[PDB]
């Protein structure tokens, strides 16, 4: 069967595993270029795609900060609501 | 869970009957225009010339919907396996 | 073809724009303008050119979300897991027996 | 009539693919005959930004 | 022209295979043979012995 | 010439195209010969399963 | 996933009734055209000659959609396997 | 993919129900056609003589449509397996 | 492809209701005819005798299609296995 | 070919609803007959006594068709298995 | 419990006919507008200019729903696999 | 007892076709309203403006019901997985 | 006999297109009320004020059934799995 | 013979939509009563008081059948499994 529910792994672990997968997919391209006997410029033209994918995974990982623990976040956990414990105004803090 | 794709070839035709069944409903609207022109000229013969363009216009429009319905029935068969 | 008449393939090229580089050069141009003009902090120039950027950055660094957005961390479709009883366990044991 | 009769006889004896369908055995045999690469699945549904508007996406699973 | 055409055909493809092919491809191959004979690349482009 | 589409002669005519009818006859004979065997086998299997359980 | 192609031979014949159901709907329009022309003539006998052309027009042409509603059902059986 | 041909013998009869459902529709145009001749004769008895051909003509075509639908229903069973 | 003949006995009964739904469609044309005769009588009492032959006629032929539609569903059961 | 016979007991009760869908259509013919009798008597009360049999006639014939449809649905269950 | 996902590809082309049956039901209402415009001008020709906006206004709206009914069946095939 | 869950993905579309067949029925109520406005204006031109608000009110909350049906048919596909 | 329970999840949605097909058939009844109001005002202009109280009452309660018919289709989906 | 028992749970929610399709069919006959009341009041406003007892009676008891059709589909779900 199937179910609509929560994500299995945390965001940080998900991004970590994605970065590892792109590292593998880039290492394979690099090993293949080395087996073919390509130079630096040809290796660049070969594996620039996987390099950019790895860099984007790294950007996502660096961009995601795990949340800090405090009384407001714990109360939001108890209330089971998506809540930002860094805003005095909510949706208007985006414009204020 | 398990996943069974099924391709029912018989369904190439079951819809064609329904599409064919809906071609005859506009025919009443088709004849409703000529009937209207008939009764209109039967109440005012002199106006028969000025309402004939409306009569031809309405026949085509009512007929077109039946004709539009027909496209699905003919498109359902001669290309789909 | 009718879809061929309902199609627009009159494109010429793809304009590629590094909005990150453009944002960097915009900020650099703002800094260069403010330095050349030697403008103070109370100027409307300085206010318009600095305050909204600082406000949005401060908000994006102050944000401490207990949970990520809706379609990124939950409400996701997941295949049902194998149970430790009944038929799933029997299939697991049969798999272990066949493999070994 | 000649064309459709020949095509029908070849579709019957499986020397030619049926009308509108790509057949696997015939395609693989023709590739082996012409010495060409075999028809693979070059698509990448899990590429970044292909099924973002898809409410029912496809799940990655190492078979 | 027929003599040269069918000489070329029986030399290159064969009379049985030529008879087995279609009338269109037959005529195409006959036209190619006619061009080869009219050209006469081996006689220095000259219809002499 | 205009209706054929070819200026020299018809297409898909010839013994190479006529033989496909006999090839189809032989292929259908072989196919029915194998299908009768397979159907008899499956019917024997089903009659076994039924007369064993039912 | 697995793929089971099926050929439902019964759908060759099911659709025949499905199209057949729509063959009698145009009859109401067809008779309507005459039910108009009668009353129009009873309203004005002298104009009967000028409405008769537009009385057979819609007559046969509503039946034409009935014909294509019927031609599918007859094309559904004696050619398809 | 796998290929299971099936021949459903129950579907020999289902279409006959839908055809029989469509045999009764033209009865409306039948009654509308006799009704129009009734009312037109009540409004003008002297004209009743030359509207009778129009009445029988409309009824016969409408009945033919019913007959054709019914013919499909009866041909569907007593010959097909 | 493999060939499985199946005989669905349930379909012996389904069509009966489907034609039964078609048995009521002529019932409105019945009263359309009787209402026509009634209103033509109120239009002209003196013509009441001359339109009665078209009443019983205009019913029974419309009723005939209601019979055949009813006949099939009753023939559908007590002979078909 | 292989012969699989199936007996769907569920079809005992589906066709009963399929017939029950059509039981309400003759009620419109019933009310049409009574409406005609009412408007005719309001047009000419003297003719009321002459149209009363017709009214009783036109109801019963329409009602009978409904009864036949209803009878099938009740004959479908308490005798069949 | 057990879970069998099935993907029925025949419903791609069944629903096309099921929607196609409904494309003609607006047409009988479409022709009502022009019939009304005809008879209204037959009652008062001088008003034919002031009602003609309401005539065009009455067509494109009544026609629109037919088009919307036609959209789904065309949305059903040329995008879904 | 054993529990076999199934998820029929074809059922995403059948209802969409049925609702699509139902989107057309308000179209005759639109032209019914506008035909009423036409005949009321031809009966009495001086009342052309007082019934124009009702000409708009009759269309708005009539076409809305067509939209709710159409809203389901399009909501039936582009949100359900 | 062995008990094979099946839970068809596709069946959550098919009924929604049926209820949606029944959301349209009130619209003709809705527009009938305003059509009656229009022709009633064209029959008696000054009476238009004392009929409007009897015009909204037929509007809402005809609309009300559509809501309940529309309610089921929305209650069929957003709560059921 | 072998006895395979199946319990289709989705039919519990299919029949909800099936009965839902018939909840709006009365609505035309609900607003028809007030339509007749409007036309009769326009004919003779003094009679408007004598008719409204025979209006509400014909109104509610035409509405009542819709309730009997609606209650089923609502009783179909919250108690049945
Ligand atoms: C405005 C008043 C002037 C501010 C006073 C000056 C100051 O320094 O600010 C101190 C205080 C800490 O601010 P901060 O040091 O700048 O930020 C660091 C963290 O945010 C610190 O996060 P925190 O977990 O420590 O939150 C502390 C929170 C108190 O948190 C609780 O008490 C939650 C438990 C409730 C018990 C029931 O606020 C207070 O201490 C007093 C106000 C209440 O200011 C606020 O927290 C603003 C409160 C204004 C109301 C917002 C909602 C408060 C309660 C939210 C509960 C979780 C959300 C549930 C949804 C409902 C939302 C309405
Ligand atoms: C600055 C444009 C640089 C350029 O050469 O760009 C040239 C292109 C035209 O190139 P092509 O016609 O060859 O495709 O035009 C543009 O990109 C201008 C886009 C205008 C819309 C944005 C405002
Ligand atoms: C006013 C004149 C500004 C000027 O001359 O600015 C001059 C500078 C010069 O930068 P360079 O030295 O890198 O060439 O231009 C820029 O840096 C970019 C200006 C924006 C041009 C693109 C317009 C579309 C906006 C998309 C870019 C991202 C948004 C940036 C904020 C606008
Ligand atoms: C002629 C037609 C086109 C006219 C276009 C003119 C648009 C003018 C509006 C510019 C809007 C400024 O909006 C600003 O955009 C930048 C990126 O551009 C966003 O910036 C965001 O992305 C950039 C890179 O993508 C990151 O480097 C940055 O840290 C992040 O905040 C800001 O958060 C937003 O505030
Ligand atoms: C401004 O618009 C108002 C916002 O509307 C909110 C949407 O409606 C509330 C839906 O929230 C849910 C979601 C799921 C459920 C569950 C699954 C718990 C209900 C259930 C078990 C009956 C199916 C209940 C309520």
Mutate-to-test residue for ligand 2 from C10, C11, C15, C22, highest number of ligand atoms within 8 A of CB:
C15
CA distances from H10 to C27, H6, I11 (A): 78, 12, 5
Instruction: Give chain F's length.
Output: 54
Question: Which atom of ligand 2 is nearest to C12's Cα?
Answer: 14
Q: Are A94 and C62 in contact (CB under 8 A)?
A: no
* Nearest chain C alpha carbon to D61: C79
Sequence-distant (6+) residues with CB within 8 A of L25 are K25, L66, M24, M25, M27, M28
Q: Per the CB < 8 Å rule, is A6 touching C55?
A: no
Sequence-distant (6+) residues with CB within 8 A of J10 are I10
Cα atoms in the 13 Å half-sphere on the side-chain side of C80: 15
Cα–Cα nearest to F9, from E29, E9, E22, E21: E22
Sequence-distant (6+) residues with CB within 8 A of A25 are A50, A53
Q: How many domains does chain C have?
A: 1
Sequence-distant (6+) residues with CB within 8 A of G50 are B41, B45, B48
Q: Per the CB < 8 Å rule, is L10 touching K5?
A: no
Cα–Cα nearest to I28, from I63, I54, I52, I73: I63
Residue with tokens 């998900």: A14
Question: Hey, CA dihedral for G18, G23, G29, G35, is it positive or negative?
Answer: negative
Q: In what helix (H) or strand (E) does residue D8 lie, and over which residues does it extend?
A: helix D2-12
Provide the CATH number for the domain around residue H16.
1.20.20.10
Dump strand ranges (E) for chain L: 2-8
Sequence-distant (6+) residues with CB within 8 A of D57 are C77, D51
Residue K47's domain spans which residues? Answer: 1-81
CA A78 to ligand 5 center in whole angstroms: 19
Q: Are L16 and L77 in contact (CB under 8 A)?
A: yes
Cα–Cα nearest to G56, from N77, H53, J48, K11: H53
Virtual torsion, Cα J63, J65, J68, J72, nearest 10 deg: -120
CA C33 to ligand 3 center in whole angstroms: 12
CA distances from N14 to D7, I18, K11, L32, M4 (A): 46, 19, 17, 33, 19
SS (H, E, C) chain G: CEEEEEEECCHHHHHHHHHHHCCCHHHHHHHHHHHHHHHHHHHCHHHHHHHCHHHHHHHHHHHHHHHHHHHHHHHCCCCCC
Partners of D56 on chain L (C-beta within 8 Å) are 81
Backbone phi and psi for residue E30, each to the nearest 5 degrees, phi listed first: -65, -40
- Dist. CA L72–CA M72, nearest whole Å: 12
Q: How many domains does chain M have?
A: 1
Residue A1 contacts K where some CB pair is shorter than 8 Å: yes
Token readout for G4 is 């089971």
DSSP E22: -
Bridge partners of residue G4, in order along the sequence:
B6, H2
DSSP D17: P
Q: At what angle do helices G11-21 and H48-75 cross, to 10 degrees?
A: 170
Token readout for J38 is 């009412």
The answer to whether L and M touch (≥3 CB pairs < 8 Å) is: yes
Experimental method: cryo-EM
Token readout for G61 is 């042409």
- Dist. CA M12–CA A86, nearest whole Å: 43
- Dist. CA C57–CA C61, nearest whole Å: 6
List helix spans (H) across chain I.
11-21, 25-43, 48-75
Cα–Cα nearest to I39, from I49, I48, I50: I48
Q: In what helix (H) or strand (E) does residue C57 lie, and over which residues does it extend?
A: helix C44-62
Helices (H) and strands (E) in chain K, counts: 3, 1
Binding site membership of C59 for ligand 4 (Cβ less than 6 Å): no
Virtual torsion, Cα A39, A42, A44, A49, nearest 10 deg: -140
Token readout for J29 is 């013919």
Sequence-distant (6+) residues with CB within 8 A of N24 are M22, M23, M24, M25, M26, M65, M66, M69, N66
Token readout for K79 is 């995008």
Q: At what angle do helices M25-43 and M53-75 cross, to 10 degrees?
A: 170
The answer to whether H and I touch (≥3 CB pairs < 8 Å) is: yes
Backbone phi and psi for residue K31, each to the nearest 5 degrees, phi listed first: -70, -20
Cα atoms in the 13 Å half-sphere on the side-chain side of G10: 20
* Nearest chain H alpha carbon to G8: H6
Sequence-distant (6+) residues with CB within 8 A of C48 are none
- What is the helix, strand, coil percentage profile of chain A, to 5? 70, 5, 25
Which ligand is located closest to the Cα atom of residue C17? Answer: 3
Question: Would you tell me which residues 26-55 of chain L have a C-beta closer than 8 angstroms to some C-beta of chain K?
Answer: 26-32, 34-35, 37-39, 41-43, 45, 48, 55
Which ligand is located closest to the Cα atom of residue M78? Answer: 5
Binding site membership of C20 for ligand 4 (Cβ less than 6 Å): yes
Strands L2-8 and H2-8 come out as unpaired
Sequence-distant (6+) residues with CB within 8 A of A16 are A61
Q: Are G39 and B41 in contact (CB under 8 A)?
A: no
CA C22 to ligand 4 center in whole angstroms: 9
CA distances from B8 to C84, G19, J71, N22 (A): 37, 20, 37, 31
């Amino acid at each position: 069967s199937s179910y609509t529910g929560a994500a299995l792994a945390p965001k940080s672990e998900r991004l970590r595993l994605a970065f590892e997968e792109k590292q593998k997919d880039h290492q394979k391209c690099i090993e293949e270029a080395k087996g073919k006997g390509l130079k630096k410029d040809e290796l660049i033209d070969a594996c620039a795609w996987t390099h950019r994918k790895t860099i984007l995974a790294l950007k996502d990982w660096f961009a995601y900060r795990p949340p800090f623990q405090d009384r407001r976040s714990k109360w939001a956990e108890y209330c089971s609501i998506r809540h930002d414990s860094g805003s005095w105004l909510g949706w208007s803090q985006k414009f204020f | 869970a398990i996943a069974y794709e099924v391709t029912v070839n018989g369904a190439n035709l079951i819809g064609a009957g329904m599409a064919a069944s809906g071609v005859g409903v506009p025919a009443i609207g088709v004849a409703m225009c000529f009937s209207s022109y008939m009764l209109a000229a039967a109440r005012q013969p002199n106006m028969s010339a000025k309402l004939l363009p409306y009569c031809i216009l309405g026949f085509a429009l009512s007929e077109a919907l039946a004709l539009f319905t027909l496209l699905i029935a003919l498109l359902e068969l001669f290309v789909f396996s | 073809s009718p879809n061929e008449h309902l199609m627009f393939f009159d494109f010429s090229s793809w304009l590629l724009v590094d909005f990150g580089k453009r944002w960097e050069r915009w900020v650099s141009f703002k800094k260069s303008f403010l330095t050349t003009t030697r403008s103070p902090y109370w100027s409307p120039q300085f206010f318009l050119l600095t305050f909204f950027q600082l406000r949005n950055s401060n908000v994006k660094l102050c944000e401490n979300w207990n949970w990520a957005p809706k379609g990124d961390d939950f409400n996701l479709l997941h295949n049902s897991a194998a149970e430790p009883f009944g038929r799933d366990l029997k299939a697991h044991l049969e798999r272990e027996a066949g493999a070994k | 009539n000649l064309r459709v009769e020949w095509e029908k006889n070849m579709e019957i004896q499986k020397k030619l693919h049926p009308s509108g369908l790509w057949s696997e055995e015939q395609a693989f045999a023709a590739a082996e005959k012409l010495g060409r690469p075999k028809a693979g699945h070059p698509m990448r549904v899990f590429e970044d930004g292909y099924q973002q508007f898809d409410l029912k996406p496809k799940l990655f699973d190492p078979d | 022209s027929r003599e040269a055409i069918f000489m070329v055909i029986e030399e290159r493809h064969g009379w049985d295979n030529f008879k087995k092919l279609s009338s269109h491809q037959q005529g195409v191959i006959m036209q190619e043979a006619a061009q080869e004979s009219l050209l006469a690349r081996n006689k220095g482009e000259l219809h002499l012995p | 010439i205009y209706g054929r589409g070819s200026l020299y002669g018809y297409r898909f005519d010839g013994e190479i195209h006529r033989q496909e009818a006999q090839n189809v006859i032989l292929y259908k004979e072989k196919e029915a010969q194998e299908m009768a065997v397979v159907m008899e086998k499956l019917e024997k299997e089903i009659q076994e399963w039924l007369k064993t359980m039912e």
